[PDB]
Design a protein around this nucleic acid. Structure first.
Ligand SMILES: [K+]
Ligand SMILES: [K+]
Ligand SMILES: [K+]
Ligand SMILES: [K+]
Ligand SMILES: [K+]
Ligand SMILES: [K+]
Ligand SMILES: [K+]
Ligand SMILES: [K+]
Ligand SMILES: [K+]
Ligand SMILES: [Mg+2]
Ligand SMILES: [Mg+2]
Ligand SMILES: [Mg+2]
Ligand SMILES: [Mg+2]
Ligand SMILES: [Mg+2]
Ligand SMILES: [Mg+2]
Ligand SMILES: [Mg+2]
Ligand SMILES: [Mg+2]
Ligand SMILES: [Mg+2]
Ligand SMILES: [Mg+2]
Ligand SMILES: [Mg+2]
Ligand SMILES: [Mg+2]
Ligand SMILES: [Mg+2]
Ligand SMILES: [Mg+2]
Ligand SMILES: [Mg+2]
Ligand SMILES: [Mg+2]
Lengths: 146, 140, 186, 260
RNA sequence: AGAAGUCCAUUGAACCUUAUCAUUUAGAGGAAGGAGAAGUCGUAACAAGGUUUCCGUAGGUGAACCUGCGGAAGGAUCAUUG
RNA sequence: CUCCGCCGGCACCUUAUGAGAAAUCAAAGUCUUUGGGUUCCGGGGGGAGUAUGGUCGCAAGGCUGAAACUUAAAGGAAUUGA
RNA sequence: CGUUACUUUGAAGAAAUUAGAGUGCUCAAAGCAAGCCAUCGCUCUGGAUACAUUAGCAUGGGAUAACAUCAUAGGA
RNA sequence: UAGGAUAGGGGCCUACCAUGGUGGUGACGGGUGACGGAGAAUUAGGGUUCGAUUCCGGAGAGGGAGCCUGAGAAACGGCUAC
RNA sequence: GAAACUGCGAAUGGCUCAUUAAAUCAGUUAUAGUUUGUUUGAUGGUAUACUCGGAUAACCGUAGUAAUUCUAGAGCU
C-alpha cells in the first residue's frame, strides 16, 4: 500500500526478510518496524509505531534527529507532499514610538504521515537538519483548532 | 486625533515616514537633486574665468556687482561667481584659474545680487584676501 | 566548475539573488563516475578535501553480495543491470548506481548452500551437523526459481562513484516481489 | 580567510591577560594544546608579564630554550604553550612550583604549591565512552585520554592525576554538596558548594552554588569544576579563598590598609 | 609507466544576433513659469470699487474678463408675531 | 388649549469659573498639571493641482501627482487713521 | 497533561570606545601603571566595577492585557 | 521518491512525480554618492545624523572565468585562457 | 660548512570597500550534517634483514637564444 514509488521503500537497517522473526524484540530488530522517541518530552504518536508508511524524514520512524529550536505556530498551508507552511505570529517592538506591530514568519516544516493537519491547527515543530531547500523543521505535535 | 494604540507602532512609523517628505530640508537632503548642482556636493570647485561681467543689483540698491563667469573643470558647468573686496575684478582675467566657494546661503542667492550663489575665493592659486591686503602677488 | 552553492538559486519568494562572491573550492562538485558494467575494471584515485581518498569506479564487473537470510556474503560477477528507479537511461547504458537492480552469478551461493546445508538447489559429525541444519531449512522458491537460471536479483547498496565498489544484497521477500512485478511490467 | 589565523591582535586578546593597550600591535597567539586559546595563560605571559623572569619576547625564548620550565612535569620550549586551569608550572632550578588557579576577579594567578602537592593535578572528565577494541576510555577538558578508567567515573567528574605515574589516584563524583570552583563566566574564581542542579532537557544545565559566607550564584555546568569531596577542597586556594568581595568591601579593605 | 594528439561531457570567459531595459543625450519647432528693467492697452479686485464678491460647470471675448445654470457669505441683511 | 416633569432633535439667549492670536466658542472647554478610541489630512509664499507616468471616462474631464527654478515675506485676527 | 504579552531575578551580550574605582605621567590630554627610609627585597602589589536595545535561555509573580475555549461539561 | 555529486545536509544537480512557494505584516522591482557591526557627532529626557579607515565579520586583487599544489586557496607579490 | 636535493612556509599579515539590502553582519542556536597540516593525550600484534634497487641535483663541461631563476645534450654521486 505504501509502495507508491518506482522503488521499494524500506526503513534503513531493518531486515524484513529475517527468518528468526520475533515481536518481543526492540524496534528495528527481527524485522520489527523501527521507531524512536524524539526526546524533549514529546510522546511518540501511536500511528507512527503502528504505521505502514515509510518516511525517512519522519522524526519518530525516520533518520532525522530533533536538535536546536522548538517553535510553535499555526498551520498556514498544507498543500504540499508531507510539507506544510507554519505561520508564526509575534509582536515586534518599535523603540521610538514605544509600541508594537504585528509581524509574521512563514516556516516550512516537514510533516510525517503520523499526523493529519489542516490549515489553522496549532502545531509544534522542532529543528532538524536541512531536509530541502527551505525546510529545516519537523512537526512534532498537532493540536486541532477545535 | 492621532493614533495611540499599543499595537499601532507600524501606523505611527509609516505616517512619520510619509510626512517627513513635507519638510523642505528633509526632502532637499533625501531627493538626490543636490548631485545635479554645479558643485555636486562639494564645498569648493575650480574653474576657468570665461568672461568678466557686471550684473545690476536689486531694485532698492543701485550698483554694478561685477561678478565673473566661470566654467567648472570637474563637470564643465558654467556659473556666475561674485568677486568681493573692492578692486578685485582687476585681479581676474580670462582663462585664469579660480577657486569658487558658496555665497554662504546653500545655493540661495545672497543680498542684492540676483541669481548668484558663488563667490571667487582664490585666483591663480593666491587668495583674493591676500591680493586685497597686498600680502601676496598674482603670478605672471 | 560544478558547484554546490545556494548562490545561483532563486529565493523561496522567487526573487533573484545577486551574487556577492565568486565560487569557492570548498563547495565544488565533480563530474559523475558513470560506472559501467564491463570486464575492463578501472577505479581511479580521487584526491578530495583533507588529503583524503575517494575511489571512482569507471568500469566494474564483480561485486561483494550478501544473502541476508542466510547471513552469507560472496564475491560474484555482475551479469546485467535490469532495473533503475530514477532513469531507464541508466538501465540501457548499463550504469551501476546505488539502489540499481542487477543480475549476479548464483554459482558461489549454490556452492555455499551445498557445503553448508548438504542440499543442492561424509562423516558422522558432518552428517549430524548437516541434519541439524537441514531441520527447519526453508527456502522461498522465488530465490529457487532464479537459482534455476543461475542469476540472482540483487540491489546495489554501495555507491560505486564514491567507494569504487559495486556491493549489495540479494533481493528477498517483499522487495523481491516488488521488483519482479516491476521487471515483468517492463 | 583562506586558512587559519596565525596572529592575535593585542586588542583582541583575552581580557584576563591584562595586556596593556599600547604595548604593541600584537598579543601572543596561544598555540594549540591542552587548553582552549581563550581560557589559557600562555607560557610567555607567565614568564615575562607575571613572574618578571624575562623582560622581552627574546628573553622568554632564551629561558625556555634552556629547558628550565616544566608544565605538569614535562619540559615545554613553546612560548605560546597554552597553560591552563590547575596546571602545575615547575622550575626545577629555583625549586618553585605553581598551580594555575583563578582569583575571584577571573584572572589566572600563579599559586605557590609544595613539592608534594605539585605531584598531582585535578582534571575534569569530559566524557566516558568505548574506544577501539571495546576498551573503555576517559577524556578530560585538558586534552588527556586515560584508558581503563574506574567504572564509577562518569562525565563531569573530577579525577586526581599523579603526574609522576600518570594514573587516576582518586576521583570525585559530581554531586550536590561538593565544593567547586567556577572556571568561566562572571563568577570565574568563585568557590562554593553545590546546593542543587537544575536540569532542562535539550539545553545547558544550571548549577546553583553557595559560597562559605552565604552568597548564592548560578552558572552553567560547563563552567563548574569540582575541587573537593564535601566542604574541603583537595587543593590549596589563593588568598581570597574563592570568596568574591563587593567593591564596597574592597574599598573597606583598602581604607583599613592605608589607615594601618 | 607514459608525452603529443584525439573523443565525449562539464564549467565556461569572450564574440556575434534579435529585442528590451538603464543611461547619456543633439534636436527644427512649439509652449510654460520666474526674474529684471519697464513701455503699452485698459481698469478686473480692494468702498455697494461704481454690474456686491466668490465656488463648481459650460460657452464666448485683445487682455484683465463677460454671460448662462446651481451653490456660499468670506455681504452691503444676524432684524417684520407682520 | 393650560401647567409640571422625562427622553430625544433643530436651535437660541446670558455668563466665565474655561479656552483662544483674537474674532469668537457652552464647545472651539475639561492641554507644558501635556495620553478616552479611531480615520483622513498640513509643514513659509509661488512654480502648481502644473509637467510626467498611471488609472477612470465617449468626451468634457476626474483621481493620483512632482521637480527645476524663484522669493522674504505671503497670510490670520484685531487697533488707530485715511 | 491552555498558551502569550508584561514584570522580577539569573546566565550571556569580545576587546577597544563610554560611564566609573585606584594611581601626583611635574599638571593635563594620558597611561595602566606603581608604591614602600633605600629593601640582594617586600606590598599574595594593582591591573576594579557599571552599562550593554531587540531577539534567544532560565527563575519567581499573575494585577493588567491578548489569543484559544467557554451546557452532548453530557463532567468525574 | 530514487540516485549523482560533495568533507558533509540540501533542487546542489539529474530522472520521474505533484502544484506548489512569496506577497499592503509590502512580496517582486527600483534607488543608495549602501560593505555590516563594535562604534562616532550632537544630545534634559525622548531623539537626529554618520559609521571608507587601525577591533570583529565579509568581500576583492584591471574585468570575467577556470584550475594546479596543498591540511587549508577557486590564491592572484601561483598558473591557464578571453 | 657555501651550493644543491629533501622538508616546511609562502592560504597569515598588509591593503581596499567595488560588488552586495534578510544578502553581508549582529546577538543567539545546531552539526545526531562535516573536514581540520599542526599542538596535547592515548593507542598500534596475524605483510638480503648484520639492512634492498634504480635514478637525480649540486659538481663538471658541450651548447642554443636578442633575451628571462628561457632552455637542450654528455659525465658523476
Ligand atoms: K573562510
Ligand atoms: K466684476
Ligand atoms: K465685494
Ligand atoms: K427639548
Ligand atoms: K550533500
Ligand atoms: K529530492
Ligand atoms: K601544506
Ligand atoms: K605550504
Ligand atoms: K549570527
Ligand atoms: Mg473695477
Ligand atoms: Mg463690480
Ligand atoms: Mg497633546
Ligand atoms: Mg508650503
Ligand atoms: Mg538525496
Ligand atoms: Mg559601494
Ligand atoms: Mg566600517
Ligand atoms: Mg565609496
Ligand atoms: Mg587608508
Ligand atoms: Mg578588517
Ligand atoms: Mg580571495
Ligand atoms: Mg587598479
Ligand atoms: Mg584569482
Ligand atoms: Mg602586488
Ligand atoms: Mg596576497
Ligand atoms: Mg588576511
Amino acid at each position: 500500500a505504501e509502495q507508491t514509488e518506482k522503488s521499494f521503500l524500506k526503513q534503513p537497517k531493518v531486515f524484513l526478510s529475517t527468518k528468526k522473526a520475533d515481536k518481543a524484540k526492540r524496534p528495528g530488530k527481527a524485522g520489527n518496524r523501527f521507531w524512536k522517541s524524539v526526546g524533549l518530552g514529546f510522546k511518540t504518536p501511536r500511528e507512527a509505531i503502528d504505521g505502514t508508511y515509510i518516511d525517512k524524514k519522519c522524526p519518530f520512524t525516520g533518520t532525522v534527529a530533533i536538535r536546536g529550536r522548538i517553535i510553535a505556530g499555526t498551520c498556514h498551508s498544507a498543500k504540499m507532499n508531507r510539507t506544510i507552511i507554519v505561520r508564526r505570529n509575534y509582536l515586534h517592538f518599535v523603540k521610538k514610538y514605544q509600541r508594537y506591530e504585528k509581524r509574521h514568519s512563514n516556516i516550512p516544516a516537514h510533516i510525517s504521515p503520523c499526523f493529519r493537519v489542516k490549515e489553522g491547527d496549532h502545531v509544534i515543530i522542532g529543528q532538524c537538519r536541512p531536509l530541502s531547500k527551505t525546510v529545516r523543521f519537523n512537526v512534532l505535535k498537532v493540536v486541532p483548532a477545535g | 486625533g492621532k493614533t495611540r494604540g499599543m499595537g499601532a507602532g507600524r501606523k505611527l512609523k509609516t505616517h512619520r515616514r510619509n510626512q517627513r517628505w513635507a519638510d523642505k530640508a528633509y526632502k532637499k537632503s533625501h531627493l538626490g537633486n543636490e548631485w545635479k548642482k554645479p558643485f555636486a556636493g562639494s564645498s569648493h570647485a575650480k574653474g576657468i574665468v570665461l568672461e568678466k561681467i557686471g550684473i545690476e543689483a536689486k531694485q532698492p540698491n543701485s550698483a554694478i556687482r561685477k561678478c565673473a563667469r566661470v566654467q567648472l573643470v570637474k563637470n564643465g558647468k558654467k556659473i556666475a561667481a561674485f568677486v568681493p573686496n573692492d578692486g578685485c575684478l582687476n585681479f581676474i582675467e580670462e582663462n585664469d584659474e579660480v577657486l569658487i566657494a558658496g555665497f554662504g546661503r546653500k545655493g540661495h542667492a545672497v543680498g542684492d545680487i540676483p541669481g548668484v550663489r558663488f563667490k571667487v575665493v582664490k585666483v591663480s592659486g593666491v587668495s583674493l584676501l591676500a591680493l586685497f591686503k597686498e600680502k601676496k602677488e598674482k603670478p605672471r | 566548475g560544478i558547484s554546490r552553492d545556494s548562490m545561483h538559486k532563486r529565493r523561496a519568494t522567487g526573487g533573484k539573488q545577486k551574487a556577492w562572491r565568486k565560487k569557492r573550492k570548498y563547495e565544488l562538485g565533480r563530474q559523475p563516475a558513470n560506472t559501467k558494467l564491463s570486464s575492463n575494471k578501472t577505479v581511479r584515485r580521487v584526491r578530495v578535501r583533507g588529503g583524503n581518498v575517494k575511489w571512482r569506479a569507471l568500469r566494474l564487473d564483480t561485486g561483494n553480495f550478501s544473502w541476508g537470510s542466510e547471513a552469507v556474503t560472496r564475491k560474484t560477477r555482475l551479469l546485467d543491470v535490469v532495473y533503475n528507479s530514477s532513469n531507464n537511461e541508466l538501465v540501457r547504458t548499463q550504469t551501476l548506481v546505488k539502489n540499481a537492480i542487477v543480475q549476479v552469478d548464483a554459482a558461489p551461493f549454490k556452492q555455499w548452500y551445498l557445503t553448508h546445508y548438504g542440499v543442492e538447489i561424509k562423516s558422522n559429525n558432518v552428517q549430524r551437523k548437516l541434519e541439524k541444519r537441514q531441520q527447519g531449512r526453508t527456502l522461498d522458491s522465488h530465490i529457487e526459481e532464479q537459482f534455476s537460471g543461475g542469476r540472482l536479483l540483487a540491489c546495489i547498496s554501495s555507491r560505486p562513484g564514491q567507494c569504487g565498489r559495486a556491493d549489495g544484497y540479494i533481493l528477498e521477500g517483499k522487495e523481491l516481489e516488488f521488483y519482479m512485478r516491476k521487471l515483468q511490467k517492463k | 580567510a583562506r586558512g587559519l589565523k596565525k596572529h592575535l591582535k593585542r586588542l583582541n586578546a583575552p581580557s584576563h591577560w591584562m595586556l596593556d593597550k599600547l604595548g604593541g600591535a600584537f598579543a601572543p597567539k596561544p598555540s594549540s594544546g591542552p587548553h582552549k586559546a581563550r581560557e589559557c595563560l600562555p607560557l610567555i605571559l607567565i614568564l615575562r608579564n607575571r613572574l618578571k623572569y624575562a623582560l622581552t619576547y627574546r628573553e622568554v625564548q632564551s629561558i625556555l630554550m634552556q629547558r628550565h620550565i616544566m608544565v605538569d612535569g614535562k619540559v615545554r620550549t613553546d612560548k605560546t604553550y597554552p597553560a591552563g586551569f590547575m596546571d602545575i608550572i615547575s622550575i626545577p632550578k629555583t625549586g618553585e612550583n605553581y598551580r594555575l588557579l583563578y582569583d575571584t576577579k577571573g584572572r589566572f594567578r600563579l599559586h605557590s604549591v609544595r613539592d608534594e602537592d605539585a605531584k598531582f593535578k585535578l582534571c575534569k572528565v569530559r566524557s566516558v565512552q568505548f574506544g577501539q577494541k571495546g576498551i573503555p576510555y576517559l577524556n578530560t577538558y585538558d586534552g588527556r585520554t586515560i584508558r581503563y578508567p574506574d567504572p564509577l567515573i562518569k562525565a563531569n567528574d573530577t579525577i586526581k592525576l599523579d603526574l609522576e605515574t600518570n594514573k587516576i589516584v582518586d576521583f570525585i563524583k559530581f554531586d550536590v554538596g561538593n565544593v567547586v570552583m567556577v572556571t568561566g563566566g562572571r563568577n570565574t574564581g568563585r568557590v562554593g558548594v553545590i546546593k542543587n542542579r537544575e536540569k532542562h532537557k535539550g539545553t545547558f544545565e544550571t548549577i546553583h552554588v553557595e559560597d562559605a559566607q552565604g552568597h548564592q550564584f548560578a552558572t552553567r555546568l560547563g563552567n563548574v569544576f569540582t575541587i573537593g569531596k564535601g566542604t574541603k577542597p583537595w587543593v590549596s586556594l589563593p588568598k581570597g579563598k574563592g570568596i568574591k568581595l563587593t567593591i564596597i568591601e574592597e574599598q573597606r579593605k583598602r581604607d583599613a590598609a592605608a589607615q594601618a
